[PDB]
Design a protein around this nucleic acid. Structure first.
Lengths: 127, 121, 206, 81, 97, 159
RNA sequence: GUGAAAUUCUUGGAUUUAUUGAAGACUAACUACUGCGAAAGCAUUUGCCAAGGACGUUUUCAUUAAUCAAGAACGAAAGUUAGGGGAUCGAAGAUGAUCAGAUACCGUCGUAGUCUUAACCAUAAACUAUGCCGACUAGGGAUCGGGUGGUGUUUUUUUAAUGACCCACUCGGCACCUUACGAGAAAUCAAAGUCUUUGGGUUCUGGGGGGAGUAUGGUCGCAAGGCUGAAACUUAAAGGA
């Protein structure tokens, strides 16, 4: 006896997203970016913005009757890092703190099979 | 600290060799004695030699302490030395065990084997 | 030196079938040993099962080379051993050296338990790696007690057994000696038994 | 070793050492008189085929060529020589 | 000085190699020299895992991993104290600890 | 319901409504990710698959059979590698073993050869008579050229 | 995205995820005091193609060989000429950063080039900064390739068979340790040893520091440029350990 919205988190760097949808996700619901819960504008990726941010995800999920939740983590990804930033950790523990249930966890970080030539230039990024 | 010194140790460690027998732990009976023996400078120095010594006879008894032996510990090693009796004589399993590949050289070498051995991992 | 019975008598297939010494090893047959009877289709090397009475009892005249057996030792540093090599040191000649070997003890005039031998020996040539080297030096013959496993360069003869646990490490020197003694010493010449057990010989405490 | 007769060493050390060093060189390959079962015939085959030879004519097959030594079929006595 | 009987790295019979880009330097740099490491950790962490197998709807699931390799310039390898400076002799080692 | 497939997800798509109960047709298959990137190690051969295919239900499907070498139980060396020509022979095997369990066909009839991982078996027993192998997936599986609706060819998948 | 930043993407829902696709690029870990090539240089797999080293050899020919001014193949990359390719990096150019300035370092994009066919150029710290042939000195323990011997280790299948293995030996490597009898300015060197007890064979090079590998001529190249290579003038040190 429960329903399941899908998470749809992500934290590079300098920002992070708690972003609920349906389990299909052609529709969406309460999306929360970092800067939003911090106007320093400095630390937009903070172990905290995420923290008070996730709690928006169970305010506007424990609003439109999302009991419970399955949960996705994405890096940048791409070319980039594939080393999850702060975010995703603090979220993954604040989301458990907000009554929410949890189910099926897994990365999605977009991996390439090579090719797109990475930025910087040969001799590199450098201070 | 409280950390001992050469002049001191190496004065008790020389002493402890001869005088284990007069030898004690009431250290106030060594203190006196430790003048009749060494030809010491001072009173302070002298009270720090015997302090150390009593740190030897209080642990010697407890057991074998290190790089120091005085004709009394070395005669309990010709007394503790020796042992197992009987020496090795198998009856009980007689035949003495002889890998079963242990028959070729010694069929090509002697006189009497009372042997034990692995008919074939 | 063909004799008479040193020859197998009425019991040399009965007593090592409860102890395993024909056995070899897992997926391992080391180019460096005639010292593997075939090799079966289900598991495992059935060590050749007639030639350890060939280079564990060369191994007994070579000495017979001691005028004074405490030089005739037993080399080690294991657990199941410290109760057969300590012990080869008791019932005849030898300083036991199990546990501390005493590194140098054969390199180099500067140590403790002092060595200057002429045929030492060596349980595990994986535990005893310095009669192959403390010999590839200067003038100290050696003898490894050469499982399917013993770099053979410079321990010039073979001494095969089996050590994957259990007994036969200690309970095998026993045979170096018995039969070294029946050249020279004091025991007795088919049989009038031999007053220990191969089931004194095992542990002392786990 | 400070020394050794290299004339004649062991028989051992040759069997293993490479064909072209036993001192005087000599081959390993050698021939092998085959009764296919049907006929009595006896064809003189070589240990390293390169050719499968047919047996005599029965048209049979015998021995496939591989890296070095044929793999001979089932029937074949293959007495060596 | 020569420094380094290889040279730096891993290349022989082999003449020239397909290079890699650094996660960090973001430099380029052949797959010899490189200096590769698997972190692998539990997405979860120690502190929380208790609030996870707690509030899950799973009577346990398990705890799925997080795979990845990691490429480094040698510069950023020392700046970030992955590789150090091993005296001269403790070089010609090659042990994890 | 089970926990042995604990990994691996099903992509379903809604074909049509009713009542409020949207029915469904199979979309495709996925592994978790992770478990793919795990099963791979350093130190050993990696292989790969594929083959497209006209089922007959007339669906066009591409499948992926990843598969490793395993060592031997009893194998000095640190490894477990392949030779190469043996791998050439390894991939070709796989091709047939999959067209064959795809003609012998349908999505519905196909589906319950993916759930109980029976193709996985069929690989190992044509392969052993080569090489050892482990892990052997299908990893994926994706649609292309699925034909026209046929409401109940699907409403026959329910009751 | 960072040392910390900001430029940058963000209902036109990025970053994440799933799976499939497309394209050109590379050949991970294995991968080492190890492989082969004249050097440059070469790692996914298999098939042709011809080449070659080392051994082994009671085959052969019989002094044919050593180094080489002239001359003639190859020559990293960059760069050029015209087509193809144009993922990624990424001088140049633009940028936001930092900074007293910052035309640089840091970040994001980015032609050209990286890749290939066909043709040029011929330089490099092309590095063991050590010409090759040879011949002789002093110990070792490893390894790659062969070959020889051990009723050698497993494989077990019935014994063999091979094969992996062990060890014994050797010839040829690619190195390493240790001594110093020797050599050296020394640091160090089994070759930089056998040199004032001065000489086995021969080809290149240098004779203080700069001026300067420039100016000139002469020449190869389409160009970049190479090879050749002054002097006047100036100067008591420049340098090695």
């Amino acid at each position: 006896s429960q329903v399941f919205g899908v998470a749809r988190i992500y934290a590079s760097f300098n920002d992070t997203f708690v972003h609920v949808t349906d389990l299909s996700g052609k529709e969406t619901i309460a999306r929360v970016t970092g800067g939003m819960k911090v106007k320093a504008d400095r630390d937009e990726s903070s172990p905290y913005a995420a923290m008070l941010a996730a709690q928006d995800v169970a305010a506007k999920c424990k609003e439109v009757g999302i009991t419970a939740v399955h949960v996705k983590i994405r890096a940048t990804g791409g070319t980039r890092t594939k080393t999850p930033g702060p975010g995703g950790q603090a979220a993954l523990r604040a989301l458990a703190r907000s009554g929410l249930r949890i189910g099926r966890i897994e990365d999605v970080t977009p991996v390439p099979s090579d090719s797109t030539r990475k930025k910087g230039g040969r001799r590199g990024r450098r201070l | 600290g409280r950390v001992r010194t050469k002049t001191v140790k190496r004065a008790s460690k020389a002493l402890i060799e001869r005088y284990y027998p007069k030898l004690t732990l009431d250290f106030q009976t060594n203190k006196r004695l430790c003048d009749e023996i060494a030809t010491i400078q001072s009173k302070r120095l002298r009270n720090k030699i015997a302090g150390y010594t009593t740190h030897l006879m209080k642990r010697i008894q407890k057991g074998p302490v290190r790089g120091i032996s005085f004709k009394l510990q070395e005669e309990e090693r010709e007394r503790k030395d020796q042992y197992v009796p009987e020496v090795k004589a198998a009856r009980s399993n007689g035949v003495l065990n002889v890998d079963n590949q242990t028959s070729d050289l010694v069929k090509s070498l002697g006189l009497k084997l009372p042997l034990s051995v692995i008919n074939v991992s | 030196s063909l004799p008479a019975t040193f020859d197998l008598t009425p019991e040399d297939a009965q007593l090592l079938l409860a102890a395993n010494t024909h056995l070899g090893a897992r997926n391992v047959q080391v180019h460096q040993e005639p010292y593997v009877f075939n090799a079966r289709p289900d598991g495992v090397h059935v060590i050749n099962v007639g030639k350890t009475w060939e280079k564990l009892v060369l191994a007994a005249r070579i000495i017979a080379a001691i005028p004074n057996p405490e030089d005739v030792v037993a080399i080690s540093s294991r657990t199941f051993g410290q109760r057969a090599v300590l012990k080869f040191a008791a019932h005849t000649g030898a300083t036991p050296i199990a546990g501390r070997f005493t590194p140098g003890s054969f390199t180099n005039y500067i140590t403790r338990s002092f060595k200057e031998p002429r045929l030492v020996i060596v349980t595990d040539p994986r535990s005893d790696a310095q009669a192959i080297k403390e010999a590839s030096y200067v003038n100290i013959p050696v003898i490894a007690l050469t499982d399917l496993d013993s770099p053979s360069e410079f321990v010039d003869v073979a001494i095969p057994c089996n050590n994957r646990g259990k007994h036969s490490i200690g309970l095998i020197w026993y045979l170096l000696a018995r039969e070294v003694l029946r050249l020279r010493g004091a025991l007795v010449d088919r049989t009038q038994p031999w007053s220990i057990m191969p089931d004194l010989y095992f542990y002392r405490d786990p | 070793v400070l020394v050794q007769d290299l004339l004649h060493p062991t028989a051992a050390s040759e069997a293993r050492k490479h064909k072209l060093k036993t001192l005087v060189q000599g081959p390993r390959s050698y021939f092998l008189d085959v009764k296919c079962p049907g006929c009595l015939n006896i064809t003189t085959v070589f240990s390293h085929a390169q050719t499968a030879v047919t047996c005599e004519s029965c048209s049979t097959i015998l021995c496939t060529p591989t890296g070095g030594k044929a793999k001979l079929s089932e029937g074949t006595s293959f007495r060596r020589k | 000085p020569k420094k380094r009987a290889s040279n730096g790295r891993n290349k022989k019979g082999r003449g020239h190699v397909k290079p890699v880009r650094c996660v960090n330097c973001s430099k380029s740099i052949p797959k010899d020299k490189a200096i590769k490491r698997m972190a692998i950790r539990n997405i979860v962490e120690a502190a929380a895992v208790r609030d996870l197998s707690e509030a899950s709807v799973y009577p346990e699931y398990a705890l799925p991993k997080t795979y990845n390799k990691l490429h480094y310039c040698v510069s950023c390898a020392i700046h970030a104290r992955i590789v150090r400076v091993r005296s001269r002799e403790d070089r010609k080692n090659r042990a994890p600890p | 319901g089970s926990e042995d497939h604990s990994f691996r997800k099903i992509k379903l798509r809604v074909d049509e409504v009713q009542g409020k109960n949207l029915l469904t047709n199979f979309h495709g298959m996925d592994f978790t990710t992770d478990k793919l990137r795990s099963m791979v190690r350093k130190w050993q051969t990696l292989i790969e698959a594929n083959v497209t295919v006209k089922t007959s239900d007339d669906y066009v499907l591409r499948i992926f059979a990843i598969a490793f070498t395993r060592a031997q139980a009893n194998q000095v060396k640190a490894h477990s590698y392949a030779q190469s020509s043996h791998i050439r022979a390894i991939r070709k095997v796989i091709s047939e073993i999959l067209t064959k369990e795809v003609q012998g066909s349908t999505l519905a009839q196909l589906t319950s050869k993916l759930i109980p991982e029976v193709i996985n078996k069929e690989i190992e027993n044509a392969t052993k008579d080569i090489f050892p192998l482990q892990n052997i997936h299908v990893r994926k599986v994706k649609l292309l050229k699925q034909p026209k609706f046929d409401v109940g060819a699907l409403m026959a998948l329910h009751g």
